[PDB]
Every structure is written in C-alpha cells, then in structure tokens.
Design a protein around this ligand. Structure first.
Ligand SMILES: Nc1ncnc2c1ncn2[C@@H]1O[C@H](COP(=O)(O)OP(=O)(O)OP(=O)(O)O)[C@@H](O)[C@H]1O
Ligand SMILES: Nc1ncnc2c1ncn2[C@@H]1O[C@H](COP(=O)(O)OP(=O)(O)OP(=O)(O)O)[C@@H](O)[C@H]1O
Lengths: 567, 567
C-alpha cells in the first residue's frame, strides 16, 4: 500500500531531476542575452547572478534530489531483497534430498548471493535508469525537433541504432567469457569450502599444501577468465566512446554550416554542447545498465534454474492427511534405486506389526538406511509402495507423514546452538518439563546437570563440541521430545558404551508399550529381545523371525550372531 | 615480476589522461581570439574547426587512455586479488581446531567476501584516484597561484578543510551503523547456513516454518540496519555536494566580480570553469575514494585481526623433527580441559609400549577422543606432557608429528569427490596399486568393483552418498594408504556389521605387527585380544592390564564386559 506511494515519490524525484535537465538548457537564455544587448548596459551583470542561482542551486538541486530518491526508495528495495531472500530460503528448504547430498556449498552459495545481489541492483536500475533515460531522450528529440529541425535528429537516431547494434553484438560475443568466469569462480569457492569442511581431514594426512595448490589452480584459472571478461568490457567501452565522440563531432560541426553566426549567434552552440554532455551520461548509463540487467536476468535464470528444477517428491493433488490408528508399516513389493544405473531394493515386502518392536539387521551396504529414507519419503520407489496403517505414503501429505515418524539417524547433525535448543527442537515450543524428561530418559541428564552452563552449553557446528555418545543421546532426546507414533533408530546405540547402551535399551523398551519401534542395528545383542528380526542382504529379505528362530535356522543371522560369539 | 612494467604503463596512461586534462582548457585559448582580432576572414574559420577537432579528439583520447589503463592494470589487479585470496586460505587452514569447531560459516564467509571485495576496488582507487588527483592538484595550485591572489586559494583550501571536517564527523557517526549492519548480515547468513547444514534435521522434526521465520526475523533486522546505513550515506553525499557546489559558486562569483568581460586576464572565466569541471569530475570521485579506502582498510583490519588472533598450537623456535625409532607413547601427568570452566583430564599418565597393540575403553564422556586430539596436538595440555619415543610433542614441529600418526576418526568426513580420490588422499602421490591394496584391506574392493563407475562413483558432500560402513571402510583405506608408524582407530568399526568388522580386524592385525595400534572402542569384544587395555573413567586411568587380568580384578572393565552378557 505504501510502497506504491514510495515509488510514486521516486518517479516524482525523477521528474525533479528532469526539471534540472530543463534548467541546463535554461542557460541558453543567458546566452541569448549576451550578444544582442551585452556590454555597456545592465544585463552585463545579469549574466553573473542569474548564472549562480541557476548553476549553484541547480547542480545542488540535482544530486540532492537523487540522494533523496535513494532515501525514499531504500525501504522498498531492501524489502524486495528480503522478500526474495526469504522466498529463496523458503524454496531452499523445499529441495530434494538428492540435491542437498550432491550439492557443493561453495558454488551454490555463490549462485544464491549473486542472484540476490543481481535482483537488488536490477530493480534499482529498472526503476531509476530506464524510465528517466527514456524521458530525457524523448525531451531531447522533441526539443531538437522544435528548435533545430528534422535532419539532425534522424542522423542521431541512426547513430544510436548503430551504437545499440554494436553493443548487442559485443555482448553476445562476451557472454561466453562471462559464463566461463562465473563457472570458474563457483568451482574455486566450492573447492575452498569443501576443503574447509574437511579441515580435520587435511590435518590428519598432512595435506595442507596439497589443498593450497589445488585452490591456487582454480584461483589463477578464474583470474585469467576475469582478465578476459574485463578486457572485453574495456573494448565495449572504447567502441561506445568512439561512437559518442564521433556523434559529438558531427553535432558540433553541422551547426556552423549555415553561417558563422547562425540563427542565434550565442546560445545555439552552448545548447548543443550542454546537450552533448548530458547525452554522454545516458549512453554511459544505458549501455552499462542494459548489460547489467542482461547479466542480472542471466544470474536470476541460473539461480532459479538451481532452485526450481528440483521437484522430486511432491504431494498428490488434494492429498488427505495420515490417520495413524494403528502404527503398522507395510513395504509392498518395494523396488528402488538412488540412481537408475544401480538398483538397490529388489521387490522388498515386509509387514511391521502395529505396536511391535521390529529390528532390521544385515551386512554393511545391504540397504537399511535406504529403508529408513524411503519410509520418510525422501525418495519415491520405482515399483511397489509403502503403507502406514493401510494408507499409501505416496498418496498422503509429506507433513502429516513425517509428523507421524521420529528418527534417530545414522549420521546426526545438531544446530550450532546450546544443548537445550537441540533437545527441545523435537516439538515446536517444548516446555522445560518435556526437555528434562527426554534428557532423563536418554541417560544424558546427569551429564547436563554436571555441566557448568547446563542446557546452555555450546555444541558448536554440527554438534561436534560434544562427544559421540553425548551427541547420540542428544538425538535420542530430540526424538523423545517429538514423541511420534512410529520411532526409528538407525544405528542409534553405536557411539555408546555397553552401560549407557543398556540404559537406552531399557528406555526404548519402556516407551514401546503401544507404539511401533524399528531398530536398525549391527550390534545384534541389543536387538535380541525384539519381536521380529528382518535380515537384509543386497536389497532382499534373506531371513525373518525371532532371535531364537533365526539362531536355530543357522543362516545369515546366526552366523553374524555367532560372529559376535567368536570374541 | 613483470607487473611493475604494467603499472608503469598504467601511470603513463594516467599522464596521457592528464594530457587530455591540459587539452580542454588549451583549446579555449584559440576561441578567445575571435572577439577582437582575426578579421582577415580566414582565421575565423580556422579557430572553430580547430576547436571542434581538439574537443572531439580530447574526449575520445581521454576515454581511450582510461580504458587502456584499465586493460593494462587488470592483470596486476587480478594477480593481487589472487595472492590475497591464497594467503587468506593458507592462514585459514592454519587456525586451531577450536576456531573451526566454534566457527559460524555464514558470518566468516561474509567477512571473507567483504575483505576480498574491499581490496579489489581499494587497490584500483588507491592507484588511479589518489595519485592522479594529487598530481592534478599540485599542478593546478602551482600554476594558479601565480595568476590568482590569496583570497580565492585560501578560501578554497579552507573550504576543503571544512569538507574534511564534515566528512570525518559524518563518517564517525556512520561507523556504528555500518558495523551493526555488517554484524546483522553476518548473523543472518550464519543462521541460514546452519539451518541448511541441518536440512535432514529440519526435515526430521517438521520444522521448516520455524527456520523460515527465524531467518525472516534476521533478514528484516538486517533490512532495517541497511536502510539506516544507506540513509546515512545519502546524507553524507548531500553534505559533500552542498560543500562542493557552494565552493563552485564562490569561485564563479569572486572571479566575475572585477569586470563584465574579465577580472585579471582575457580568458579568466572560461579557463576557471573548465578547470573547475575537470576538477569536479575527479573530486566527485574523491569524496567516495576516502571512505572506500578507509572502510576497506578497516575491514581488512577486521579480517586479518580475526585471522591473526593468536593461534593455539604453534611450533617452538627452531623446532626439530620427530624421529620415530621406537613408537612408544607416554602421557606423563596430562591435565587438560577444552574450556577453563570444565577440566576433562586429571593427571592422566600411561605408557603405550613400542610396537604393542593397546586398547582404550571406558564409558561415554570419559575423554578418549581427547587423548587422540591431544596426541595429535590439536590442543596443548594444561599440565604434563606427551612423548613419542621419549620426544616431547610440544617441542617438535606439528608436521613431523602428524606425519608419524594416522587416524581413523570417530566422525569421518570425505571430500565431495570420487571414492578413489579419498582413498588416495592418504599418501602424497599414491599409486593405483597401493590404492587397490588399501581397498582390498578395507573390505571395499568387491563393493567398488561392483560399482558401475567403480573408483569414480560420487560420494557427495561429507561422503553422505555412501553408507556409514562404506565411509568407515573408506577412511580405513585412507589411513592404510598413508601407512604411518603409529595407527589410531577411534571407534573405527562402529558402522560395520560383525562380519565386515572381523574382516577389518584381520586387516588391522595383518598390519602393525611391529607397529603401535591404539584402538578406542566401545565394542569390547573387538579389543579383547589386545596387549593392554586402558580403562578411562571421568578423565582418569581407572585400571590397566590384560583382558583376563582386568576381568579377574572385577572392576570397571569387567562390569562393562558383563553388561554385554545381560539377556
Ligand atoms: N546418494 C546416493 N547415490 C547413490 N546410491 C546411494 C546414495 N545413498 C545411498 N545409496 C545406496 O544405498 C546403499 C548404501 O546405503 P544403505 O542404505 O545400504 O545404508 P546402510 O546399509 O544402512 O549402511 P551401513 O549398514 O553401511 O551402516 C548402497 O546400495 C548405495 O548405492
Ligand atoms: N571445544 C570444546 N569445548 C568444550 N568442550 C569440549 C570441546 N571439545 C570436546 N569437549 C568435551 O569433551 C567431551 C568429549 O570428549 P571425548 O569425545 O573424548 O569423550 P569420549 O568418552 O571419548 O566419547 P565416547 O566414549 O562417547 O565416544 C565432551 O564432554 C565435550 O563437551
């Protein structure tokens, strides 16, 4: 509502700058009163005073208006940037898991910040350089048609057309170097950020100099590309300057052609030269702003290509919610692979009973975390389907599905905040009672109590300032705070000692009264008291049954289990 | 290097630009002689043509010289930028682990980009706006001091002094808003990046809207700060423009006062106004050049201040190298805490014998990964010391120390590249034979062979496109490729099943026959066949000895072992 008023005032400030653009010809009137009635009279002094008022205030009136425009437009501009940024962030959290797994933080950060800065500059240039230069050029044309004639304006319009054509050709020739420079910079920053993510790895193998040289190669490649791009910019500027200066010469040469004095001996030449000076400004601004908006649209296209192309998992039209009356999982002939060149799950079918305690075991690489990810609908299966209480996961909203599921993941990450924030993250606005209950049920309560800052101790980036077992128990506390009707533990008790592991096992058994618990574990002794044990091998269900049943069948599970008994 | 020659040419271009600066007033003299003499009917036609030619050529040569300066300085600028970026990166990889653990990637990235963007334009402005304007001011003052009295020149210098006072006052008032805006933008970007790092966590607890609103709050805070900063910038610009335009008014008022035609010479007024315009063009830049170099140097000071913040672990002067004749490690009364408010290790002392296979066990939080980190000298101990073959770790170079150690870490991270790159990352220039041997000793050979892209399969960011056990085995392959004289496995077989765990254990036993192996493990069954077992409790050495000996002692180790036997 008020942004409209602000931009209206901005256009009015543009019109006041147009009043200054009028004031510059106004000195033509001074020049008219110079030769006809000059020395030996009163007007000889009138040239001075009226000049200062026209000049001193006039120039001051111009810039003062321009900056005022800025101060009345900044809120409109920043909001737009913010409105983009928030939207970008809102879309950034709606991208598929494949992207955020295969992403390169460096080049994607470059693309995001570049797109934001591009729209930030492009809105300003679109609102403050297109319309003002168009108005000024229209006024130039009408004033030279009412004061000079038809020939000069036609010569100037064809000169400007050749100028625009040359600019377009040079920009089409420069686009290649521009894109190459951008790609090289993105690759360099991606390499730098990925090296910094593996700081500990770089220290572990004495590979500081290797990474230094690796980044240096990309840096000098980008440097060469930028040299080429800026030299192309300089060439375009030299061409534009040649066009402008030859047009200036033609305009200053065709005025004295009729007579030595012309129609107006004093005033014609000053009108022409002032208009040439105030014409070099719109061409200098217009070429740069046209190519700037071109690059801004290409950066917006790049950014929005990265953003909007990522539509993997989506809700069906008018999708109902998940109604969890019985927390029962059903994999029906599930066929899935992450990439089409390697199938991972081959017709997997199993029924996790409602309110049961089912374990999922198998050798490394068998595809257990893929079962977890498919249950969460991070990916969709190729064939078959997944049911929760007889409801197809593919035909229900993602929010209601993921709300009914709580997972302690294989590789858990924490926010760079305090312990209490991460623990309370399970539910939106968790009370200290709930957070303390989860921290007590996760064998982490005494540890936090012995902490000097307690729930306010820092965990650092990804939670790496805590131990492995402490971080595991923090993730357990999060999933306890959430308390959904389907609990899933993907190697949850790996980083724990046997004592804390038995504590967490007693907890998991206590909170599984009428709720479903799916425990993926390689430490078989923890899942020995489960209702059913599903053994997975190369993406197929090898065996299924009780611990005693599978031990007696003497198949894959028994061997594995007996492989624990070897030591 | 050769860049010196380039900058010489750059200054030459600058002087050629000054050749244009002379030519614009120099032409006006030829126009002066049209009023009184030149009435042979020939010279009236010579003066005009020569003026037009001189003006067109002057302007075109000016822009041409400027662009040539740019094109001959671009290589020097890019070189400088690249060298700065490389230095920043090199120092970024030499900061302590405390920084990279407590760092916030967003605001640090903001600071880095700010410093780079500042230096890129700062060098250009320092070399092409400071020195040219200084030379122009010296020439203007020395030539105009013999033609004008004391009043005008002293008024101009006092006007410039008042200009400097106004600029300094407004900049000192704006520095606060600038720094606050910078801090808010850094915090907003840090929050956004930390939310994106926890993408999976945000998906696990349905907290998209929470993070969206959090970033939106930070964004609107930054928007308000930026609006304030830009309004302050506009106020400074209007003040500077007022000062400059009133000075031009005073210069165009005290010169026209003497006579209607000229105060002291025939061409006083036009010479004065031409030099005033050709000084106002560089002056309008100068009012932006002081704050640009000031804020660029102060942001450089901020960046390099943060970087130069004295690192934690450093080499002693003239530090010798580590000579591992017998890999026997000795923690002698090691007292350490990460923060001063919580001590972790309380007088820890233990002797890992040369060529033995020692295990480190204990409850979660006891401080075992702290033993590993102190052995790597990521931190220095408060009391006591650490010895490798009787040599103080604190008195030896960090590089030679970390070369003698190879670690499979608790939380392993891979580079966003192929599997083969990560495996070969161990040694500098590893042969494909060694990489295949490591992949065979890490139970991944058959897996990678069954991969369609084999060693060229992507692992994604942090290696999260591979499983947990696959990533563990890849890290084992790295540490095997490195082949150092002291191997340390911090919960290396956690993500593996018992079968692959026995494979990796057979590997660990095939290697390190007469080498030291320190295994930190919670899965006690794997370390039961060790030479000695160090039990750690709350940061102290509880017991030590053989599996049978500690089992006989019926202490902390036995209890833990018995806790596996619970049914
Ligand atoms: N981003 C990806 N691209 C391609 N394949 C993937 C990706 N993520 C997972 N996989 C597939 O998943 C399988 C390995 O992960 P899986 O889901 O088996 O984990 P897991 O068996 O739970 O891990 P572990 O038992 O090793 O701890 C392999 O078949 C692998 O191809
Ligand atoms: N930079 C730091 N600032 C504060 N505390 C830290 C820092 N780094 C580590 N710690 C603390 O050290 C402890 C972890 O040390 P360590 O990882 O050796 O435990 P652990 O017993 O070996 O782990 P686990 O046995 O659970 O794998 C935690 O209490 C953690 O808070």
């Amino acid at each position: 509502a008020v942004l409209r008023r602000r931009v209206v005032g901005a256009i009015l400030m543009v019109l006041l700058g147009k009043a200054t653009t009028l004031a510059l010809p106004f000195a033509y009137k001074k020049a008219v009163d110079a030769m006809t009635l000059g020395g030996g009279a009163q007007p000889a002094l009138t040239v001075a005073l009226a000049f200062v008022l026209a000049y001193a205030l006039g120039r001051f009136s111009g810039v003062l208006f321009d900056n005022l425009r800025n101060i009345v437009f900044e809120r409109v501009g920043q909001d737009a940037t913010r409105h983009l940024a928030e939207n970008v962030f809102a879309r950034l959290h709606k991208l598929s898991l494949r992207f955020h797994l295969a992403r390169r933080t460096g080049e994607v950060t470059k693309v995001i910040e570049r797109g934001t800065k591009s729209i930030d500059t492009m809105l300003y240039f679109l609102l403050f350089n297109i319309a003002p230069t168009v108005i000024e050029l229209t006024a130039v044309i009408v004033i030279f048609w009412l004061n000079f004639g038809l020939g000069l304006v036609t010569a100037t319009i064809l000169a400007v057309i050749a100028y625009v054509w040359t600019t377009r050709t040079i920009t089409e020739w420069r686009t290649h170097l521009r894109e190459k420079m951008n790609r090289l910079d993105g690759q360099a920053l991606a390499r730098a950020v990925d090296s910094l993510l593996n700081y500990e790895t770089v220290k572990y193998f004495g590979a500081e100099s290797r990474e230094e040289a690796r980044y240096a190669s990309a840096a000098r490649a980008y440097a060469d590309a930028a040299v080429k791009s800026e030299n192309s910019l300089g060439l375009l500027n030299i061409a534009q300057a040649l066009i402008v200066n030859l047009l200036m010469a033609g305009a200053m040469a065709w005025t004295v052609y009729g007579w030595s004095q012309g129609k107006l001996t004093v005033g014609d030449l000053v009108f022409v030269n002032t208009y040439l000076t105030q014409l070099f400004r719109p061409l200098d601004m217009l070429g740069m702003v046209y190519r700037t908006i071109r690059q801004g649209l290409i950066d917006m296209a790049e950014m929005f290509r990265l953003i909007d192309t990522h539509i993997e998992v989506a809700d069906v039209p008018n999708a109902p919610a998940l109604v969890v009356n019985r927390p029962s999982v059903t994999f029906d002939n599930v066929v899935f692979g992450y990439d089409r060149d390697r199938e991972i799950l081959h017709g997997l079918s199993f029924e996790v009973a409602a309110g049961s305690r089912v374990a999922i075991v198998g050798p490394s690489g068998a595809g257990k975390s893929t079962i977890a990810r498919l249950l969460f609908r991070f990916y969709d299966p190729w064939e078959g389907r997944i049911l929760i209480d007889g409801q197809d996961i593919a035909h229900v909203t993602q929010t209601s599905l993921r709300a009914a599921l709580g997972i302690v993941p294989q590789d858990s990450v924490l926010f760079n905040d305090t312990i209490g924030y991460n623990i309370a993250y399970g539910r939106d606005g968790a009370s200290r009672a709930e957070v303390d209950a989860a921290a007590k049920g996760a064998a982490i309560a005494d540890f936090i109590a012995r902490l000097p800052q307690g729930y306010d101790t820092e965990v650092g980036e990804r939670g790496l300032k805590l131990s492995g077992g402490e971080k595991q128990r923090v993730a357990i506390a999060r999933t306890l705070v959430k308390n959904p009707p389907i609990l899933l533990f993907d190697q949850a008790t790996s980083a724990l000692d046997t004592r804390t592991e038995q504590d967490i096992l007693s907890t998991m058994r206590a909170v599984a009264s009428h709720r479903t618990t799916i425990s993926i574990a390689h430490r078989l002794s923890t899942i020995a008291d489960s209702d059913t044990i599903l053994v997975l091998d190369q993406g197929r269900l090898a065996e299924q049954g009780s611990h005693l049943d599978l031990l007696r069948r003497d198949g894959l599970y028994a061997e594995m289990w007996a492989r624990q008994a070897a030591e």
